[PDB]
Symmetry: C2
Subunit: 194 residues, 2 copies
């Protein structure tokens, strides 16, 4: 369930606006290639035109080792998340938008054959499952002081979240991520904050 998939998108019903994509990966264990993002094909599958509305683009990459656990961060921009190497992560999302889906969750394994569109307001995180992973994402806005109040964070280890991690005991977590508020102390992101 890795090579040769048809390019396709599925909405995540618990988190409005999120999309999971199957990405065609061609080859085998020795090497492969993919079109990780293709704007002309992905728009008709539901990738939102609003992603492109301001003409802003940034691609970040992090290279991380097994058991690293980052999150859960709702940064004030949309994100398209992918894996660029042979690794894999347990992707994890918690909706922090005010409304009937506040606190809703989704989890899936992200590898080179699966990508995820995450709307602004949905907190993102991952735990690295493979020995290492190249985690490559696109965003549609740039850091600005005025955006600082528009972030929201929730603690990866709040046991009331409808998520589980692969290896909570051996997780390698930043000091900041250890100290994010539990869900009960998150101020839901209002329409004015998005």
């Amino acid at each position: 369930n890795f090579f040769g998939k048809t390019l396709a998108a599925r909405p995540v019903e618990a988190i409005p606006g999120m999309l999971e994509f199957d990405i065609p990966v061609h080859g085998d264990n020795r090497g492969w290639f993919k079109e990780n993002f293709q704007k002309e094909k992905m728009l008709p599958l539901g990738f939102p035109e609003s992603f492109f509305a301001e003409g802003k683009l940034q691609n970040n990459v992090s290279f991380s080792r097994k058991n690293v656990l980052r999150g859960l961060h709702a940064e004030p921009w949309d994100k398209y998340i992918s894996v660029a190497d042979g690794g894999k992560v347990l992707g994890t999302w918690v909706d922090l938008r005010e409304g009937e889906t506040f606190g809703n969750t989704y989890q899936t394994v992200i590898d080179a054959s699966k990508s995820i569109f995450v709307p602004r307001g949905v907190a993102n995180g991952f735990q690295v499952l493979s020995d290492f992973v190249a985690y490559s994402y696109l965003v549609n806005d740039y850091w600005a002081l005025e955006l600082k109040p528009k972030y929201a964070f929730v603690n990866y280890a709040d046991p009331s979240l409808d998520i589980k991690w692969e290896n909570l005991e051996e997780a390698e977590v930043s000091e900041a991520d250890e100290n994010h508020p539990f869900l009960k102390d998150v101020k839901p992101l209002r329409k004015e904050d998005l």
Copy 2:
């Protein structure tokens, strides 16, 4: 250095329009992060605004093993090339555009701390130096039949090209790449045709 470089651009004087970038990579052997592409920071360094003129975007990734050698291909679109994991390649370019700089070459090692802007009509290739590499690039057009005349190819092993590959004896080359035409049989690409 791999880590901690200042974001910078250098023109490649042998191939008009080509740019080499140093990318700041933060971390160490255990794990790191980079802004692989940040449009607002790149434009004032000389990344061409023309790349974005038609609003087209595609990200391709190839995951390849040591001694794989691919090229040399000039395609209908501009390319921004980097590496998304801990690997490295010997990047190689041959200008296939009609005029004074046809045949001109450049080579440099690409790893996650370096990227390259390759104008359409400049042939691109690489040989993998590390055990594996995640080679991730952005392009600004999509396949279409009508672009077929915008492609040119030149053989990687043509002894007249002012390039040197590693350990050619052990290179893993596709049948197609073994049979690309020699420079003297390449029809130079007209600028008005690109």
